[PDB]
Design a protein around this ligand. Structure first.
Ligand SMILES: NC(=O)CNCCS(=O)(=O)O
Length: 298
């Protein structure tokens, strides 16, 4: 018997169809505990303690984990993040200069904490000029509803909840264009990969297979009602928000997976870690993270 705990997150993306269909468990034969995490920092800790064996991490929590020598490897990309992650603010905040003195929430060292710091740097605003507070996305929604924060840089379901009444000031497609792109990845603990390599391959296969029908023709994929309802259920968003969210990233073919895992992801971690060091969020970094990426499961 193989038991595996998988830490998943709430982005609405096509591989959620494979999760809702239980395809990984069916094809691998493992008993799979899918555990929902509110952001990536807590996933890094659960991977480090051995409580989780496969986890979905943003590129910023990934660089923190790799700088702390957590024994995990990226074995699959989930998505290249675009405007599915966004800074949503009170409507009276009209320009980036209006963020000065405001209370802006982000989950600690998430991709949106990272993107917020990169956006402030791009705008010429020191992070000390903004009251950046650390809250998990459910608490962000609650604080926003009570008017205790002025905005947040968030992903689904918080991003669409806040946008119902707020205004988008920037998003991670823009921040990517400015030179700080962010990614979502899947990582695996080494000891699990050593013992159950065919289960890890089955995970990658299930996720990659599920994204290819979307890549081939987004509009045809999005008009299959069961695709929309499965993502709405697992992300916790209204069905009407799913197409805009799914189109807010790009996804990879199998050829693109192998290409990105053979160099570009390493370079992504190096650059992400460097910026986090400059921003004071990690004490030490490395000039190479090839121990933390592999193409051998795709
Ligand atoms: N993976 C997701 O669904 C949200 N994007 C990354 C969040 S974090 O950086 O891991 O906190």
């Amino acid at each position: 018997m193989v038991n595996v705990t998988v830490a998943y997150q709430t982005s609405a993306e096509p591989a959620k169809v494979a999760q809702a269909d239980n395809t990984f468990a069916k094809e691998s034969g493992a008993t799979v505990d899918w555990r929902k995490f509110d952001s990536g920092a807590s996933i890094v800790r659960a991977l480090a303690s051995g409580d989780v064996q496969i986890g979905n991490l943003g590129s910023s929590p990934l660089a923190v984990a790799a700088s702390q020598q957590v024994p995990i490897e990226v074995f699959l990309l989930a998505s290249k993040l675009g405007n599915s992650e966004a800074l949503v603010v009170k409507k009276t905040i009209s320009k980036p200069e209006d963020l000065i003195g405001k209370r802006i929430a982000v989950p600690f060292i998430s991709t949106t904490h990272y993107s917020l710091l990169a956006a402030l740097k791009h705008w010429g605003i020191k992070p000390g000029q903004v009251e950046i507070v650390n809250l998990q996305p459910p608490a962000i929604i609650a604080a926003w509803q009570r008017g205790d924060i002025d905005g947040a840089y968030v992903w689904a379901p918080a991003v669409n909840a806040l946008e119902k009444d707020g205004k988008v000031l920037t998003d991670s497609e823009q921040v990517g264009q400015w030179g700080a792109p962010t990614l979502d990845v899947w990582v695996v603990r080494k000891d699990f990969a050593e013992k159950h390599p065919e289960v890890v391959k089955a995970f990658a296969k299930s996720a990659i297979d599920a994204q290819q029908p979307y890549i081939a023709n987004p509009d045809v994929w999005l008009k299959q009602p069961e695709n929309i309802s499965k993502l709405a259920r697992l992300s916790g968003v209204p069905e009407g928000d799913v197409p805009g969210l799914v189109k807010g990233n790009t996804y990879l073919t199998p050829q693109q997976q192998t290409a990105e895992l053979t160099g570009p992801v390493n370079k992504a971690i190096i650059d992400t870690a460097q910026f986090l060091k400059e921003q004071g969020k990690v004490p030490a970094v490395a000039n190479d993270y090839s121990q933390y990426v592999t193409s051998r499961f795709v």
